[PDB]
Amino acid sequence: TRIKKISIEGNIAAGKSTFVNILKQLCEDWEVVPEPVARWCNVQSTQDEFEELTMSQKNGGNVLQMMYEKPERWSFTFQTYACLSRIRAQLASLNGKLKDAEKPVLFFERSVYSDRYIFASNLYESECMNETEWTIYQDWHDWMNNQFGQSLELDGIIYLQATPETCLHRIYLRGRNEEQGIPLEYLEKLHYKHESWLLHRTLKTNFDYLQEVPILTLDVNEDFKDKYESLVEKVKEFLSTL
Amino acid sequence: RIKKISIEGNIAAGKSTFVNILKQLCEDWEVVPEPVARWCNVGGNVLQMMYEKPERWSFTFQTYACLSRIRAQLASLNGKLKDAEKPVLFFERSVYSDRYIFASNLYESECMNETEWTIYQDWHDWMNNQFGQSLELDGIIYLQATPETCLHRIYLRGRNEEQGIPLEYLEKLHYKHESWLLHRTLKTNFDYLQEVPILTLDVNEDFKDKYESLVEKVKEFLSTL
Ligand SMILES: Nc1ncnc2c1ncn2[C@@H]1O[C@H](COP(=O)(O)OP(=O)(O)O)[C@@H](O)[C@H]1O
Ligand SMILES: Nc1ncnc2c1ncn2[C@@H]1O[C@H](COP(=O)(O)OP(=O)(O)O)[C@@H](O)[C@H]1O
Ligand SMILES: Nc1ccn([C@H]2C[C@H](O)[C@@H](CO)O2)c(=O)n1
Numbered sequence: 405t406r407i408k409k410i411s412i413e414g415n416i417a418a419g420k421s422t423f424v425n426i427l428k429q430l431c432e433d434w435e436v437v438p439e440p441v442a443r444w445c446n447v448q449s450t451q452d453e454f455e456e457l458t459m460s461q462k463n464g465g466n467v468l469q470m471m472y473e474k475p476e477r478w479s480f481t482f483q484t485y486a487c488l489s490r491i492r493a494q495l496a497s498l499n500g501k502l503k504d505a506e507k508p509v510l511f512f513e514r515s516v517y518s519d520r521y522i523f524a525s526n527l528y529e530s531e532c533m534n535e536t537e538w539t540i541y542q543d544w545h546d547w548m549n550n551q552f553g554q555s556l557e558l559d560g561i562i563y564l565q566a567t568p569e570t571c572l573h574r575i576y577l578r579g580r581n582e583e584q585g586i587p588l589e590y591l592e593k594l595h596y597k598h599e600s601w602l603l604h605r606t607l608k609t610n611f612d613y614l615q616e617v618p619i620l621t622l623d624v625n626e627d628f629k630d631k632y633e634s635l636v637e638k639v640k641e642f643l644s645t646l
Numbered sequence: 647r648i649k650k651i652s653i654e655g656n657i658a659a660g661k662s663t664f665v666n667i668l669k670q671l672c673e674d675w676e677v678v679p680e681p682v683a684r685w686c687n688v689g690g691n692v693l694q695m696m697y698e699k700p701e702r703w704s705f706t707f708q709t710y711a712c713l714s715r716i717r718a719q720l721a722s723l724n725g726k727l728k729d730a731e732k733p734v735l736f737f738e739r740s741v742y743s744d745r746y747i748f749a750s751n752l753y754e755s756e757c758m759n760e761t762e763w764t765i766y767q768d769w770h771d772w773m774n775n776q777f778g779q780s781l782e783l784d785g786i787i788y789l790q791a792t793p794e795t796c797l798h799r800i801y802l803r804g805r806n807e808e809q810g811i812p813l814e815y816l817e818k819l820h821y822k823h824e825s826w827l828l829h830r831t832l833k834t835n836f837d838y839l840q841e842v843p844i845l846t847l848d849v850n851e852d853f854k855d856k857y858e859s860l861v862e863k864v865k866e867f868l869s870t871l
C-alpha cells in the first residue's frame with residue numbers, strides 16, 4: 405500500500421479516540437480504524453444468511469468484563485480475541501478505504517504491538533497468563549504477523565502520554581462499567597510499559613523495523629482545548645517528515 | 647494445483663498409520679501430520695491440560711490445535727510438491743473436524759461456555775476467510791472404526807494423556823463423524839464441503855487382514871478427483 409499507517413498509542417483513557425477522531429476531520433485523506441472495544445463488550449459471530457432473516461443477532465457476553473473480573477482465567481482468551489478483531493478491522497480498512505486519496509493516512513487506535521508488548525505481556529508478568537498460555541499467544545501472534553504484518557507495518561507512531569492519575573480520572577469520566585474497578589497500580593504498570601517501548605525505547609520486540617519507526621510523543625494531560633493547537637501543529641510537522 | 651485430501655476418523659482409528667503407508671506409493675504424495683508433538687510439548691502439555699481440566703483448557707487447546715494445523719497445512723503447500731506430475735497432499739484431519747467435531751462436542755458438553763464458543767467460531771470464520779481457499783479439500787477419506795476399536799487402539803498406542811478417555815467420549819465423537827461423513831446431516835458454514843466426495847473405509851479389522859486392498863481403493867479414488 406501507498407496508504408501511510410500511523411498508530412496512536414497510549415494508556416487506558418489517555419484520550420486517543422477523542423483526539424484522533426477530531427484530528428482526522430482536518431483532511432479528507434485521513435481516516436481512523438477504531439479499536440474494536442464494542443466487539444469485546446458484546447461478543448458476536450456471523451449469522452447464517454438464512455437464519456438471519458428470521459433470527460435476531462443476540463447480545464453475547466462481555467469478554468472485557470470477564471477479563472477484569474477474573475484475569476487469571478480470562479486474559480489469554482481476551483488477548484487472543486482482541487488481537488484477532490483488531491487485525492480483521494485493520495486489514496479491511498487497508499483494502500477498502502482511501503483508494504482515491506492524494507496523500508492517504510490511516511490512523512490506527514492501537515496496534516498488534518501494544519496488544520502483545522504492553523497488555524498481554526503485563527498480564528503474563530502479573531501471573532494472569534501461565535507459561536503455556538504465554539507461549540501459545542506469542543506463537544499465534546508471531547505466525548499471524550508473518551502472514552500479515554507486511555501490510556500492517558507502521559510508518560509512524562503517535563504516543564499520547566498521560567499520567568496514570570490522569571488516566572484513572574478519565575476512566576471515571578468515560579464511565580465504562582467494567583473499567584470502574586481498575587486500580588491506579590494497573591495503570592501505572594501499563595504506563596511504564598508504554599514509556600519503555602515508546603519514550604526510552606529499550607523494550608525489545610520480535611519486529612526489528614520497530615526500533616527505527618519514527619515516534620511523536622504528545623503530552624495530553626491538560627484539558628483538551630488548552631493544547632489542541634500545538635498538538636495538531638506537531639502532528640502535521642511529524643507527518644510531513646515521513 | 648496440489649490435490650488436498652483429508653483423512654478423518656476418531657481417536658486411534660488408524661489415520662497416521664494409514665497415511666504413512668499411502669505416502670510410500672508415489673514420490674508425488676506427501677502428508678501433513680497433526681502437530682501432536684507440539685501439543686504435548688509447547689514445555690507445557692496442552693493436550694494433557696485439556697484432558698485433565700477440559701472446562702478450563704478446551705478453548706485454549708482448540709484454538710492452538712487449529713492454529714497449528716493451518717500453519718502446517720499452509721507450509722506444506724508452499725514447499726515440497728510444487729514440481730510434481732500429479733501432486734497430492736494428505737491432511738491428517740482438517741479445520742472442519744477441529745470445529746464441527748471436537749470443539750463443537752466440547753461446547754455441547756459444557757466445556758466451553760457461550761462466550762468461548764462464539765469467540766472460537768469468530769476466530770475460525772476469520773482465520774479461514776483469509777486462508778481456507780488455499781486449503782479447500784478435493785476429497786475426504788473417512789476411516790471408520792467403532793468406539794470400542796478406538797478405545798483398544800488408544801491403549802495399544804499408550805499415549806499417557808489419553809488413557810483416561812472413557813468409551814462414552816469416543817461414542818460422542820463417533821456420532822459427530824457419522825453425522826458429518828456418512829449421514830451428511832452435519833451443517834457447516836462452508837458451502838463447498840457439501841459436494842466434496844468421501845471414500846469411507848472400514849478399518850475395524852486387524853491390519854494383518856484387509857489393509858492392502860483399502861490402499862488400492864484410495865489410489866483409485868484419487869484418479870476420480
Ligand atoms: N484532553 C482531554 N481533556 C478532558 N477530557 C478528555 C481529554 N481527552 C479525553 N478526555 C475524556 O477522557 C475520557 C477517555 O477518553 P478516550 O478518548 O475515550 O480515551 P482512549 O481512547 O484513549 O481510551 C473520555 O470521557 C473523554 O471525554
Ligand atoms: N488396522 C489396525 N489394526 C491393528 N492396529 C492398528 C490398526 N490401525 C492402527 N493400529 C494401531 O493403533 C494405534 C493407533 O493408530 P494411529 O495410526 O496412531 O491412530 P490415529 O492417527 O487415528 O489416532 C497404533 O498403536 C497403531 O499401530
Ligand atoms: N490488548 C488490549 C487492548 C485493550 N485492552 C483494554 C483496555 C481498555 O479497558 C479497553 C479499551 O482500550 O480494552 C486490553 O486489556 N488489552
Ligand SMILES: Nc1ccn([C@H]2C[C@H](O)[C@@H](CO)O2)c(=O)n1
Nearest residue numbers: 657680682711743744748749808
Ligand atoms: N481439534 C482436536 C484435534 C485433536 N484432538 C486430540 C485427539 C487426540 O487425543 C489427539 C491426537 O489426535 O488430539 C482434539 O481433542 N481436538
